Enzyme design. Sequence first.
Site: not given
Ligand SMILES: *CCC(=O)N[C@@H]1CN(c2nc(Nc3cn(C)nc3OC)c3ncn(C(C)C)c3n2)C[C@H]1F
Length: 280
Positions: A19-20, A136, A150
Amino acid sequence: ALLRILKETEFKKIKVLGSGAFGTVYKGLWIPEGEKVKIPVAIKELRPKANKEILDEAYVMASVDNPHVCRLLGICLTSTVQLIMQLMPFGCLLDYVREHKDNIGSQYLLNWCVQIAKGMNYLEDRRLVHRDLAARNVLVKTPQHVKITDFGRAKLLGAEEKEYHAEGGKVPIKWMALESILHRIYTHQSDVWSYGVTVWELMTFGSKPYDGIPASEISSILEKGERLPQPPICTIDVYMIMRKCWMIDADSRPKFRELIIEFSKMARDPQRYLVIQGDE
Ligand SMILES: *CCC(=O)N[C@@H]1CN(c2nc(Nc3cn(C)nc3OC)c3ncn(C(C)C)c3n2)C[C@H]1F
């Protein structure tokens, strides 16, 4: 690729992925009504504009269809905006290279550089300036396949706009081009600067740029001509690509199309360009 409007009963959240300030991302399952197919997805719930405005922004968002950019699959409008997107099972590339630093070879690193450049070139063709490219914000579909995403900073340029002029939003200083820091100006060429920093992150297995240095001092360091150092694994040929991305004249910098060509060539003989023990 078209935009689907989802009802809350169609999808469910399984767990938080992160999250953020943008909101929260969940791993989820999407089952389109009557389709009997279960689709693993990522649900981005944002933290109001008219519904039609939001849907119009989602429409353009869903039209982004490229192997190296995460796609919006659907949207649910309730008390909150929920964007249902492709799930990237391995998470952000920053954490991935930190976790697997001991087992990542030159082929993967250079392939990722090509893929990110391809995704950015697609965005440029769509007149989209990303404004937040960093390791990230690159996600991992499989170890062999990454995709850019994005979290709100991306902007669409109008037919006669060559740059985006930003307002007071919070800025990722250490990834930004000098002209963005000094003048709030963003272009495809400032995205190229950020691409260079992103590549530096990958080549240092997720190290922190300008480590321990206050963001407020960065413009002065850049104005003195200082740049991020050559990563241990990089031959000078690779480092010089990074350095080209950080030249003060934005038009001096490579374009993403050029970066695709150059990194693709290196990817054909990866051990010639990155020096990694046990590789292979
Ligand atoms: C280093 C940046 C970070 O950790 N950002 C977080 C994770 N994130 C995010 N994560 C996933 N998949 C994910 C992350 N983890 C640990 N396990 C999984 O899947 C099993 C995402 N899949 C798609 N998206 C975006 C297109 C919405 C993901 N975004 C963003 C931020 F919360």
